[PDB]
Amino acid sequence: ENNILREKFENYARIVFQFNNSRQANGNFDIANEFISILSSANGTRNAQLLESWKILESMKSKDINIVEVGKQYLEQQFLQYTDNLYKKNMNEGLATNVNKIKSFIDTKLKKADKSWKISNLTVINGVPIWALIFYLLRAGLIKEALQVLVENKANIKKVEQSFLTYFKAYASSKDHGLPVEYSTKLHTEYNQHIKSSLDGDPYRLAVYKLIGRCDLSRKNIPAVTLSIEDWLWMHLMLIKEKDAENDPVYERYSLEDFQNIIISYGPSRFSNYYLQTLLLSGLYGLAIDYTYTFSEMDAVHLAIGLASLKLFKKRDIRFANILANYTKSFRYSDPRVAVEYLVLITLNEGPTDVELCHEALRELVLETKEFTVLLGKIGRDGARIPGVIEERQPLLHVRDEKEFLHTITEQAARRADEDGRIYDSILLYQLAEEYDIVITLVNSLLSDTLSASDLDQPLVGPDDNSETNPVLLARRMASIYFDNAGISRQIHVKNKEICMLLLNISSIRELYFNKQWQETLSQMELLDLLPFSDELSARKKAQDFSNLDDNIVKNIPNLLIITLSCISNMIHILNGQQIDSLKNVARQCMIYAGMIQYRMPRETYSTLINI
């Protein structure tokens, strides 16, 4: 049955809900730390890949984001860290400078296996492969100190390559896209002629030349010193020239676009366990979420949330609104509240279109899940609404509609209720719409029908059909919470309140018709001022008065007659000062009345069968 997801569904929903809290409370909640947090706990390839991808996202937090430069930095920081952690594991004599940490990685980590180098050709001075040292310093972001190391080993370097030293300083002193309008041409010929085609050349020397010079953009690999997938990626990022590339009319330009295309030509299988990261680092955000769909929709959705919260976005539909709405399909009916929490991240992408898309998604959620009381509120006892979940998320809707929206969706729901004949829904909806007169007029209909019929029913005190799920109990609710409230009550027509009280009265008479108490029902029927209890002049005045009667009551008279003749018969059960003469006169005038109205009345002067 998988509690395993549902648990996972709920943990992720929790994090989003706290995100929405902070957005609303103007806090600093960090979504990426929160996934990093959960994911670090979990095991497996995908999880420990999801985890690294969230670390990628979170180190772009508040960088200005130039894709090439932040991918480079993450790769560089990653390696430095790895380097510090090796050193921060015992051994060393000297001071803990960056250089010495790298000298340690070179010497101690795997350039050796028992004092002999596991990469051939290295030029070594005083126990140090100085080109490898320059390479790895560069690899960790430490360009100035890489430059220091080349400068310091001047007298030891040569085949007159005191020249590269010049170009390196310059590449370091600019914005690392070291473009002298001059030399770069000169360093390219020296590479082609003395460096490129060696056999006994230090492979790290070639690497350093290549990268610093952007030297030979075919042959995009470094023969013996790309040791890892992130090494591979870093190198590629070093070789791109973004700024002022379309300037200088030479096709030694190599773009992010080119790079992105190479990755695609290889596919996931060539990046096993590193593909998501590769997509994220190369700026293929779309393809990155696309790829993460192939193993979990939940993960794709949330990574997309991460990307969206980083102002990016500018199983195959990859727009933010649709990623969220689609996710929601899996649980809107079971968890409408959670659906709201997701639909409200649409506004992460600030700006119209998106805002409207959010509004349309909510609107669509409400219609069709029909979860009105969760989504749109409830009740009264005055105290306006008790807000629904949408209302609680008001500020995240970027609406500042005077709650126009929310009242406009309620009118829409309500009129759909009217076409489906989902009365109850309509009454609920017009309560929220504050259409008090419409509410009462709908309540009168529903109560009217259902008072006119045939008996056995109603429940009074005990269980079975409770409040605002059955017509009388609901009519009692409305009268109580509206009629005594001046401000609400003035908004409802006197006529409409009169009909309401009439129908409620008839219900009181039903409660205490059977339940014994035949005397008490006659009294109340009489008070209704509807049936003749006096003389024959009143039975025909109840006819003049009968065709002026509102359509709601003109339909209830049937059973009013016949509850009257019934008490009037259970009571005058010819007994064992006994005025039976009235209680009998009453039946008379009632039968004269039911004689003159009858073709205006269903199909039953079977008042005769209880008359005699």
Curated annotation (Swiss-Prot):
* Topological relation to the membrane, as annotated: Peripheral membrane protein
Tell me one GO molecular function of this protein.
Answer: structural constituent of nuclear pore
Q: Which residues form a coiled coil?
A: none
Q: Where in the cell is it found?
A: Nucleus, Nuclear pore complex; Nucleus membrane
* Single GO cellular component term: nuclear envelope
Q: Which UniProt keywords apply?
A: Membrane, mRNA transport, Nuclear pore complex, Nucleus, Protein transport, Translocation, Transport
Superkingdom:
Eukaryota
Query: Which residues span the membrane?
Result: none
A single GO BP: poly(A)+ mRNA export from nucleus
The similarity comment for this entry is: Belongs to the nucleoporin interacting component (NIC) family.
Complex formation: Component of the nuclear pore complex (NPC). NPC constitutes the exclusive means of nucleocytoplasmic transport. NPCs allow the passive diffusion of ions and small molecules and the active, nuclear transport receptor-mediated bidirectional transport of macromolecules such as proteins, RNAs, ribonucleoparticles (RNPs), and ribosomal subunits across the nuclear envelope. Due to its 8-fold rotational symmetry, all subunits are present with 8 copies or multiples thereof.
What further fact does the record state?
A: Present with 15500 molecules/cell in log phase SD medium.
What does this gene product do? Functions as a component of the nuclear pore complex (NPC). NPC components, collectively referred to as nucleoporins (NUPs), can play the role of both NPC structural components and of docking or interaction partners for transiently associated nuclear transport factors. NIC96, which is localized to the core of the NPC and the distal ring of the nuclear basket, is required for de novo assembly of NPCs. It is involved in nuclear GSP1 import.
The name under which this protein is listed is Nucleoporin NIC96
Question: Gene symbol?
Answer: NIC96
Residue window of the full protein shown: 204 to 835 of 839
